[PDB]
Amino acid sequence: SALGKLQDVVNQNAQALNTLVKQLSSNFGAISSVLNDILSRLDPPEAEVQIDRLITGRLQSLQTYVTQQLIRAAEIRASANLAATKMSECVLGQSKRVDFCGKGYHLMSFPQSAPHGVVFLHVTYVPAQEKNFTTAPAICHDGKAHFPREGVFVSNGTHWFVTQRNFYEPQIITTDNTFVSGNCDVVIGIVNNTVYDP
Amino acid sequence: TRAGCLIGAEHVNNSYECDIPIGAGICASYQTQSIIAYTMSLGAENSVAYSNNSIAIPTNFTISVTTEILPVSMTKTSVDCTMYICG
Amino acid sequence: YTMSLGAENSVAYSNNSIAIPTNFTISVTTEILPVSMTKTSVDCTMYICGDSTECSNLLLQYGSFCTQLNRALTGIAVEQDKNTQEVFAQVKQIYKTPPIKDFGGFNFSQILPDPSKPSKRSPIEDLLFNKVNGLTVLPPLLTDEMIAQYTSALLAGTITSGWTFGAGPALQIPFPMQMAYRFNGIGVTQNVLYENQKLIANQFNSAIGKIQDSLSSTPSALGKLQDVVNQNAQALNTLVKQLSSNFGAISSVLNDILSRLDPPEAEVQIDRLITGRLQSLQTYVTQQLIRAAEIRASANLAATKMSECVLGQSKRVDFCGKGYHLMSFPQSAPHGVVFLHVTYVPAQEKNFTTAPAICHDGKAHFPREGVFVSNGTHWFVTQRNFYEPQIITTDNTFVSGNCDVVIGIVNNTVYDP
Amino acid sequence: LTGTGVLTESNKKFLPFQQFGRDIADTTDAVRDPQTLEILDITPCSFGGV
């Protein structure tokens, strides 16, 4: 059922054709479904009337088929446009669009050919083992307020560290890992710590 | 139910992940044996341990591969209406 | 009159002048998208022939036309539940906010569920809801309460864990830090938010209150959802009313044909009605398929927005509202979704003199980030989206090449700490 | 005035000269009893898919 999305397209089109073929067996009010059985039974002025009934019916049947094919084609076209977009953004690049190239943080993708379609294998990074840390918006040092340069300030209960947001890897808070702006009387929730100067 | 009269399924007060949808919040499933009907839940509840000074940071990660399947094209049919209609 | 395309604005362009905002506001805009439409169903045989056996037997001579029509409407009805799930069921778990809403001054009470009511709708959702033959209507799989519950989970998720719940497990973060990251994500440093946290929370809270006033005051605020309802309601009334048309037949009523005409002639008058009624039903179904397609497209857009505007921070201009996107909050609406888009908008720019680079000891210095500016006597380096002048130092700039190859380079001192 | 359906006592009030009523989609939804002059509502005879 994994490839139901492609099988559904095949099934819908197969049904449309089977339905179309089997309307040739309908009378549509005519004396018979077969033109040869009209011409061989009725004189021309009456045969033409029964034929018109079949033409109207069969023409309407065919026209119905075509209309459904155009609506369905528009749906497939839209899907194909999405697939083309994904090929460019998921395979030929790295996407920053959430859930566009799979769940998680997109790394890369690989296309695979499939009957009447394309299959994308989306490779994503997913955080697995989080832990609770105490945090602060800034460290108070010499009255100066120090903010993380690229990470987040965390504490294990006794010491403060700065680490990258998406992966716990604690570092000593130094002047190279932070920047200074404003002062300790402005930031709400600022904590006192020591900022190391290399 | 709002969707109609469901006969043969046993109604229970236990919510579950939706299996076979009926409508109006009602789903049915085969459960240990008979078919049962229930109001579907949407997912497990989860209380995030939010506070003004607490952050959760991943100490590990995994690599996942998911598969997305998209249609690209239809069968290219062509009908000769004159033959189809008249032969 | 000949319409205006808008007021003219001559930008004070020059080769050495830059405008930089010294202030900003928080703007919240409302975007309404259709997600689904009423799941109607019409039984072809009953619509055309009612309970008349004589008609039904003639309708059979038209083969599968009724089967095709019944399938087409069924397919649409199924799609409508798919559309709802694609937009709202994007969260694994149903997240809830804490009893104590310590969100750093940010008030979300108008978007979060109101616990004082029988319903679980938020104050804004109540506003959104309060003002928005063989024929049957099927109920949705996901009821309004369930949709509201999914919405609540998405809101609780965003407020307590930001975007992390949309790409892995939900990781708690103080709301103000989440917001600081969202500022960082649009090219505004984190200290801007912390220094102005009280202002930002107040601007935010005011903007949300404005949403209630806009929706309450303007009757056309949700015309996009009302239009869908009205178009389908009109289609059904139009459809049913064709049963009163004779289509060239002696009468529109099958019973007045069967009880009036001899069978071989009654048959003819009935065929006229079958053709006309089948044709009107086909017209209805084709229109519903075309409308289903535009609703599907809207639902796909809404689903994309849910993922990119709510479960993440978008860098796509005007995708998640005008301005620099910070975050979004979904709200449930009848047959649709409403997104409250929270954006950062520059407010008070000033005219500064600028330069590509600073020439120091024969070398050209460029900002690592930010732009060089001058207040008329002194040169500073500042972040691009908010005026905050810093002394130009070797830790703010990098050096590349000499002073001879940069057009517009100016002479200044670069401080060495 | 013919058709099939379920007739129940209504709470509608017809004018003295009105014999039956109709909905927005010009279909009959109520009838006056010619002998009692009471008004009855006509609902569809129950149907649906299985």
Ligand SMILES: *[C@@H]1O[C@H](CO)[C@@H](O[C@@H]2O[C@H](CO)[C@@H](O)[C@H](O)[C@H]2NC(C)=O)[C@H](O)[C@H]1NC(C)=O
């Ligand atoms: C917080 O982290 C610090 C640094 O890793 C921990 O302190 C060290 O603990 C180890 C033993 O596991 C000692 O050998 C080191 O000498 C300590 N270093 C310093 C600078 O003290 C600290 O114990 C951790 N705190 C908690 C609550 O886990």
Ligand SMILES: *[C@@H]1O[C@H](CO)[C@@H](O[C@@H]2O[C@H](CO)[C@@H](O)[C@H](O)[C@H]2NC(C)=O)[C@H](O)[C@H]1NC(C)=O
């Ligand atoms: C960080 O250190 C400063 C001192 O450098 C602390 O300042 C004290 O604040 C209290 C409360 O107003 C005063 O009563 C003390 O007299 C101040 N100390 C000094 C030396 O002036 C500040 O409170 C510390 N912050 C934290 C969170 O511990």
Ligand SMILES: *[C@@H]1O[C@H](CO)[C@@H](O[C@@H]2O[C@H](CO)[C@@H](O)[C@H](O)[C@H]2NC(C)=O)[C@H](O)[C@H]1NC(C)=O
């Ligand atoms: C969040 O905002 C709501 C308003 O939308 C505040 O509720 C109002 O509180 C005042 C008292 O100061 C009452 O007079 C109003 O009648 C309340 N309005 C509503 C709709 O309840 C709410 O107090 C704010 N919450 C916080 C924590 O500030």
Ligand SMILES: *[C@@H]1O[C@H](CO)[C@@H](O[C@@H]2O[C@H](CO)[C@@H](O)[C@H](O)[C@H]2NC(C)=O)[C@H](O)[C@H]1NC(C)=O
């Ligand atoms: C930035 O703009 C905000 C308003 O968007 C200013 O805050 C207002 O200041 C006036 C006084 O001039 C007060 O009466 C308002 O009540 C304040 N509004 C809010 C929401 O606080 C703010 O002062 C401006 N900052 C700068 C540096 O210009």
Ligand SMILES: *[C@@H]1O[C@H](CO)[C@@H](O[C@@H]2O[C@H](CO)[C@@H](O)[C@H](O)[C@H]2NC(C)=O)[C@H](O)[C@H]1NC(C)=O
């Ligand atoms: C450009 O900015 C500089 C730095 O703020 C201004 O110079 C200072 O002006 C204040 C008075 O407001 C003095 O107390 C400082 O001592 C000055 N600093 C220096 C290094 O001179 C300067 O006036 C501003 N220029 C313009 C045109 O606004």
Ligand SMILES: *[C@@H]1O[C@H](CO)[C@@H](O[C@@H]2O[C@H](CO)[C@@H](O)[C@H](O)[C@H]2NC(C)=O)[C@H](O)[C@H]1NC(C)=O
């Ligand atoms: C920046 O300062 C340097 C000197 O450190 C200037 O160099 C002068 O360049 C002119 C040619 O335009 C020569 O004729 C002078 O002899 C140079 N001066 C010295 C001391 O060598 C340079 O022009 C200055 N740039 C700007 C924009 O003012």
Ligand SMILES: *[C@@H]1O[C@H](CO)[C@@H](O)[C@H](O)[C@H]1NC(C)=O
């Ligand atoms: C965070 O703390 C809560 C207790 O408030 C605990 O239930 C939860 O499991 C902790 N999170 C992690 C990742 O350990």
Ligand SMILES: *[C@@H]1O[C@H](CO)[C@@H](O)[C@H](O)[C@H]1NC(C)=O
């Ligand atoms: C954080 O919340 C606690 C209440 O649990 C409060 O006492 C403390 O002052 C708050 N700190 C900040 C920065 O909001």
Ligand SMILES: *[C@@H]1O[C@H](CO)[C@@H](O)[C@H](O)[C@H]1NC(C)=O
């Ligand atoms: C559900 O619980 C109610 C009591 O609140 C009880 O009366 C009812 O019979 C129960 N129904 C089922 C299916 O268990």
Ligand SMILES: *[C@@H]1O[C@H](CO)[C@@H](O)[C@H](O)[C@H]1NC(C)=O
């Ligand atoms: C910049 O100067 C021009 C005059 O050249 C003026 O029209 C414009 O409004 C000024 N812009 C700002 C932000 O002061």
Ligand SMILES: *[C@@H]1O[C@H](CO)[C@@H](O)[C@H](O)[C@H]1NC(C)=O
């Ligand atoms: C900037 O434009 C002015 C004319 O307004 C011109 O004189 C000056 O040389 C230009 N600057 C550079 C670096 O070419």
Ligand SMILES: *[C@@H]1O[C@H](CO)[C@@H](O)[C@H](O)[C@H]1NC(C)=O
């Ligand atoms: C109808 O006829 C009966 C007699 O069979 C009579 O009692 C009744 O009052 C009549 N209806 C009206 C409206 O007068």
